């Protein structure tokens, strides 16, 4: 029932601040995200990091929900300010928060099951901020991230042969430092509040994450992937936009500008070893922090191994008339969730702002494989049934697994797409960040109250669903 | 009360395709009970191996109850199917497979439990079937076991001291060639099908799995054994049986000869290094496959170290007036659960065909040892209960267990006999075969639609029963 | 709130006897509790060490409760009985008996949980006893004693960092030898039995304990610590008594005096290597045993790393007019909880004899610090609610773990007192000894008709409690 591969790699996600709790436990220290959720009045919908699923406690609990889900490979999170409690390069390093890492790695080990490591997602030490700004500093912090995750392949690389460097930076860079929507939540256009400026901030926080990823995959590159042999990625994100009025050649020109700034910003760097797309580099100034000789330099010391990519929904985006403000990001686009034509951009979920659009997926895989084009593992693909533990029947979220890996095996088998894996987004329950515990996109559910999970529809299915793909002359003998 | 010895390993015993399920996934592929339990019309009762116990995906669950249960050994089966992933020699290896079965071992283990690995039983690789005949050809098929053994004692020899080669020969060679009641269901006395022989094709499969198990002894004992340092051995059945009118010649002589025809056809060659019993040499032509001298090159060029022992119930059995069909493979008899003097053989569990004849099965260790008469382990046994979860209280199985127990002490103090350890069947409740999931033979009640696992009252009873048998100078205080 | 150190060591303590069950499986010899459990009439309630919790079976389940309620240590009790499966020095060693421990200590680690092994607990082999007295005989005791430590060392000591010898001597000696309350049950004054001499006995069972302890550590100091890097120590309890009327020179001194009849007993010979307090050689005997040159040789040719400090509650000694009987092993004194002016100690729990006293608690750190005063981990602490599954909200419980570790911290940081780590006794409910099942003292209730464990209250928030004492530059952002 439509063939994907035969090694292809397949397993669930879980980013570390969502699920971990323990807080102060560990002698961990906080992160942005740890002042972020307990601001007064409540930017996170009124909702905590502290306990969340209780992971940290109950680790060994979910990960024999991996074995009873047939995963393969399980990708997390590491929480930088448990490993180094705050700060980096001179500051102290947790003893106890690496060896609470070098235990998971090495339950998941034993149960057969692939850890796939992801170094950041969204959670920077706080002390980092307060000392010279977090990703603002493009200088400071990726000199203090590239210690961070050199340690992490020292203490953990000998197990873990995938790594990712940085979560969808985009988010971390415009949520981040433009709307203040997530953590550090700093903005020109909001309430608000002290500080911000949208206009500049987020094109420095991008810039230092991008040299943040260069300088931690120079380093494996050069010291580690010799001996240790692993893979080294990046995770990006972002919605595939055709389109509005088919007919307008303004708009099939509006929807790849909108890609480029967002996928283009750093894939250009990062695996072209170009700089910024030039629709991009035109509209922003000066603004756009300047990629020096020096900084291909690090790019051109090192590979990134493959393209990790976030998916989970698509749009249609059309022009501005107007001349666009300093305070554009999106590089001037309308968006909209439906066409000329009346018709939306397909079924729905809710949320709202995730809808499924199985084919507009694929396209997506045709676009980002050849520009760019490294081997694609899709590190998040998930979705939110609409609508208890009435919530063990999601057949919703089980059409919109089968679907979308349907035209995986599209684009692989008909536009000569490498695809090698997936990961479902999530293995449980979660905080959705600054949307609190609302939104459920695991697999399992979990019970805020008893910290109790029992297993959704989907996750004793989709082990099935793989195991009809791979085959192949045995579909007969 | 009634010791058994000291050392005496027990524990639990498990068959891969009566528990794993997981029948397509880990690119496992078809073994013939796969195609023989979708027939349509079904002759397996309607029943499936496809999930069966999910034991793939809850094993480590299951392995909780052995340490629970006080188990101190535990039997189970390779998939072949699923190690080389459909035939042997040229063809591939299934790396998730060998892993798989890598884990159990190590998750045993971790446990204090002992590994007693089954490579054989009756799951032969559907591939193998097709391209040459499966059991049906000598010459190929005991070289593709070959290399399939050499592969285990290579990938699971470090661990892993104890091996059985193939479960009870018999079966698969009378039920599977000659009834057709067994996979893959060929033979001429019965609807039908398509194809079989009965008259020639089970003494062939005979000869096959003889020659088979001989060649992985032979690989055992030169390669592996002195620097591993561990036990090959075959597990054969065969129930006792005793003149039906004990008062008269040619019973004392009837009974006998079923009882060669059952376990000396196979334990001749691979204990005594004798050919086939002279009696049955007799009765079949011709279309007895002779043990070529390059056979006896291979049986004796290593050695069996034990004899396992598969045991259940006993009979009756009584000669024929008239010459015998070419369709008769029991050798010359009729057999019943009753003397004429019309008293049972004992105590019923239905089932129907299983009673509980204790005083025989003592009888019969005594026989069986000395011609052949090498140490037995007791590999399988156990019984099912006359008649929910009220199942969970099974005082039947509890005498059966005792009362067997008992015979074993008798057999061993009394008569001289070397019994090193006993084997119940089974941990879990099982699809029995082509009978399907019906008969509980299980001292765990496993419920079908939930995969919920309870323990039954025998599970920690028998715990106690042993711990009470060995003793012995503390009895004293 | 109330700082505690930072690394500061905190866990659950359990004694072998008291949960482990399985008395006569893993061919485990009888102790002397064994037989004390089931005399007739019953000298412990009716109550029974057979099964007890069954943690001989359910090991991994408890230890899952380890993790969930993140303790970092555990302290647990080897059962010499099983070990050396009755005797000492040239009795045979039970093989089936040291790899249980040994997988214990394996899981524990698997974990990230530190093991804290106590060799005795109370629990002697039976054969000892019989063969000469056990305690009563210094010579051979300690000798048996001295190779069971070695090849417990041998076995666990590379893993193992941690161990203590002897757990409270004290009552082993007084309870056992003089009043007859817990086994062996030997006294002049009691309900009876045959034997015993309170004028004696206990002071002999009290050198015995030291030489052995002094024994051990002589081998574990000369043999094992300089490759093997650990600690021993002997954990020794005795309430604080402070003057029962405040304004009187007579007791100041005689709670001082009961004291050292109590704690400097031991702690003299053991850490100061004085021998006994001058004030209990001068009221016993004679009957207190002398410290030959050759004890003190064993003593300081080795050395005890820390005090392992059991509190529970405190108390008012005080005096005796009147010349004293042959039978005082208390020290001339009267024990009251309550004083003159009529205030009782603080706080009842009940049982009744253990009453929540926090202050006291305190000036007891202070005092067994300096005279004697190694680091001190208190290797047990806790106490029963006064009062079904309502046990899972323990408020009381909370509130004296939280007072006492008040105590703790307030004794650290004023009084210069080295204070290293905390057990809370217990991780289950336990058999109380000869109390029976009665008193619940564990932070996770046991259902001992379905041997099922769910945790109380306390058991969650401790971890938190610790979380919020360690720190503490982040205490700010």
């Known amino acids: 029932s439509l063939a994907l591969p035969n090694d292809f790699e397949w397993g669930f996600a879980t980013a570390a601040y969502q699920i971990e709790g323990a807080v102060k436990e560990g002698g961990r220290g906080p992160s942005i995200w740890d002042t972020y959720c307990h601001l007064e009045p409540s930017r996170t919908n009124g909702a905590n990091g502290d306990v969340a699923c209780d992971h940290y406690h109950r680790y060994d609990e979910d990960f024999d929900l991996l074995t009873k889900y047939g995963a393969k490979a399980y990708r997390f999170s590491l929480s930088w300010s448990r490993i180094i409690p705050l700060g980096g390069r001179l500051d102290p390093v947790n003893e106890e928060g690496i060896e609470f890492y070098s235990k998971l790695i090495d339950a998941l080990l034993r149960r057969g099951i692939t850890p796939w490591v992801t170094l950041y997602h969204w959670d920077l030490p706080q002390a980092l901020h307060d000392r010279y700004g977090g990703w603002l500093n493009v200088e400071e912090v990726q000199l203090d991230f590239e210690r961070y995750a050199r340690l992490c392949f020292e203490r953990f690389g000998d197990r873990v042969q995938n790594w990712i460097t940085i979560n969808e930076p985009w988010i971390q860079a415009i949520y981040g430092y433009a709307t203040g929507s997530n953590a550090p ?34 380093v494996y590159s050069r010291d580690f992937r010799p001996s240790q042999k692993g893979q080294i990625g990046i995770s990006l994100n972002g919605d595939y936009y055709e389109p509005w009025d088919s007919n307008e050649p303004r708009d099939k020109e509006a929807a790849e ?38 900084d291909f330099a690090i790019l051109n010391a090192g590979e990134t191994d493959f393209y990790g990519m976030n998916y989970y929904t698509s749009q249609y985006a059309r022009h501005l008339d107007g001349p666009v403000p300093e305070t554009d990001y999106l590089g001037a686009i309308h968006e909209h969730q439906e066409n000329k034509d009346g018709s939306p951009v397909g079924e729905e979920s809710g949320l709202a702002w995730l809808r499924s659009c199985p084919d507009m997926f694929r396209k997506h895989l045709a676009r980002v494989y050849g520009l760019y084009g490294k081997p694609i593992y899709i590190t998040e693909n998930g979705c939110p049934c609409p609508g208890c533990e009435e919530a063990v029947n999601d057949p919703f979220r089980i059409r919109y697994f089968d679907s979308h890996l349907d035209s995986i095996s599209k684009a692989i088998t008909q536009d000569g797409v490498v695809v090698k894996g997936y990961f479902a987004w999530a293995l449980l329950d979660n905080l959705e960040w600054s949307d609190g515990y609302g939104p459920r996109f695991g697999v399992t559910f979990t019970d805020y109250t008893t910290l109790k999970r029992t297993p959704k529809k989907s996750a004793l299915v989709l082990k099935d669903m793989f195991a009809a793909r791979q085959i192949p002359e045995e579909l007969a003998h």
Not at 200 to 217: D, F, N
């Open 257 to 294: 500008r909108r890609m480029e700034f967002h996928i283009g910003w750093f894939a250009n760097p990062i695996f072209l070893k170009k700089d910024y797309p030039e629709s991009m580099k035109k509209q922003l100034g000066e603004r756009l922090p300047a990629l020096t000789p020096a």
């Open 185 to 218: 939540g700093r903005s020109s256009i909001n309430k608000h509040s002290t500080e911000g400026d949208t206009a500049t901030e987020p094109w420095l926080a991008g810039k230092a994450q991008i040299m943040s990823h260069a300088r931690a995959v120079a």
